[PDB]
């Protein structure tokens, strides 16, 4: 029995709240709060635990990293990143946790660092070709992808996409998306890389496109029910869940999921108790 964990976010300020959606029971519940208020953090499930990385505490961007113990319902602090990163991407590749880009409060970041839970250490790997804050990431077939985001050097929301291979320690550009997406909800389902929503300046998107690494091709799929940027994304049981987010003004309480076989987006029948954006999301066993 799996549950979906939703970690921090804006509602409308940074919060400590960590919620759990129980799929079988169709119910939201609070679990252990973060040690401090957090939004814009990266969240991943790695080697049996949920990790929460970086973010924003309402005043400063942070380099803190916490791990969640579901048995004791307890968050613990582990090694902090080298850089403060907020609106970063976080992903797991070969059992390393990668912290990709983000914003440190002064500048957007092209730098990338990786965490080993065996040694409890962070180290830099190769930087991206473009600095990217509000960057979505996904891992497919041994590669790490950085999708869209915002480049403060050019002041552009990005349609470009880069691919990282740990074996070469190199980032390369792959096919551009059809559309610029900062704050896209990015995830991987059945070997395909999804870019959902996001924005280009004041224009928020409900459109969705999907990337096949085998063909280096993006294709459009069905629109979401709602315009969303800064939504959390996770994949479970053949479906892509998109959680909360905002439309630039309101934070959304709803969740919707994509079935790639039927090409349909469906709203979760029970909203969160309050709108929440820039929340990270993971799926775990109950």
């Amino acid at each position: 029995p799996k549950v979906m964990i939703v970690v921090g976010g804006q509602a409308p300020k940074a919060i400590r709240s960590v919620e759990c959606y129980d799929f079988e029971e169709d119910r939201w519940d609070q679990i252990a709060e973060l040690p401090s208020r957090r939004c814009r953090a990266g969240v991943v499930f790695m080697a049996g635990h949920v990790y929460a990385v970086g973010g924003f505490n309402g005043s400063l961007r942070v380099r803190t990293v916490d791990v969640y113990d579901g048995v004791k319902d307890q968050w613990t602090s582990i090694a902090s990143m080298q850089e403060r990163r907020s609106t970063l991407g976080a992903a797991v590749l070969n059992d390393l946790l990668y912290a990709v880009g983000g914003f440190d409060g002064s500048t957007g970041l092209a730098s990338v660092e990786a965490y080993s839970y065996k040694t409890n250490e962070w180290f830099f790997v190769a930087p991206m070709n473009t600095r990217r804050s509000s960057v979505g990431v996904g891992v497919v077939e041994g590669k790490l992808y950085a999708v869209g985001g915002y480049d403060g050097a050019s002041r552009q929301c990005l349609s470009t996409v880069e691919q990282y291979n740990p074996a070469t320690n190199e980032w390369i550009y792959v096919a551009d998306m059809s559309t610029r997406r900062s704050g896209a909800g990015v995830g991987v389902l059945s070997g395909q890389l999804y870019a959902t929503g996001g924005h280009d300046g004041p224009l928020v998107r409900k459109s969705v496109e999907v990337y096949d690494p085998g063909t280096n091709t993006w294709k459009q799929v069905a629109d979401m029910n709602m315009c969303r940027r800064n939504a959390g994304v996770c994949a479970v049981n053949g479906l892509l869940y998109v959680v909360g987010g905002d439309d630039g003004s309101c934070n959304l309480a709803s969740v919707e999921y994509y079935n790639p076989v039927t090409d349909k987006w469906t709203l979760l029948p029970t909203n969160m108790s309050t709108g929440r954006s820039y929340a990270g999301v993971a799926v775990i066993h109950k």
Partner: peptide, 9 residues
Amino acid sequence: EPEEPEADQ
């Protein structure tokens, strides 16, 4: 520093 995400500044 501005509290907004970079893309919104």
